């Protein structure tokens, strides 16, 4: 009796996260008030199995 068992498993995971926050606030002596905010969040996930 001859038995040959070969098992190969492969897994790859790549995750990229990017967060950009830009805030600008200009406040004079109770006359001019301008506040602006910009938030950008990106998340990319890639999974490969074999």
């Amino acid at each position: 009796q001859e038995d040959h068992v070969r098992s190969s498993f492969l897994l790859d995971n790549q995750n990229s996260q990017n967060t950009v926050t830009a805030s600008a606030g200009i406040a004079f002596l109770n006359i001019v008030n301008f506040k602006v905010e910009t938030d950008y969040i990106s998340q990319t996930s890639l999974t490969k199995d074999y």
Binding site: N33, F34, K35, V36, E37, T38, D39, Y40, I41, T44
Partner: protein, 50 residues
């Protein structure tokens, strides 16, 4: 829907005559414009005749 084709993420059951590509795009646009105008004026006139 004989074979019940499923996407890579396993979230929807697509038919066998279509193909899906993971094209993920994010677009976040916040525009906050604050225009403030203020004025105050005070006048006082006093006249005295003796």
């Amino acid at each position: 829907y004989t074979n019940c084709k499923t996407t890579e993420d396993g979230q929807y059951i697509i038919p066998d005559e279509v193909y899906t590509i993971p094209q993920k795009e994010s677009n976040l646009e916040m525009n906050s414009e604050v225009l403030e105008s203020w004025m105050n004026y005070q006048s006082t006139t006093s006249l005295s005749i003796n």
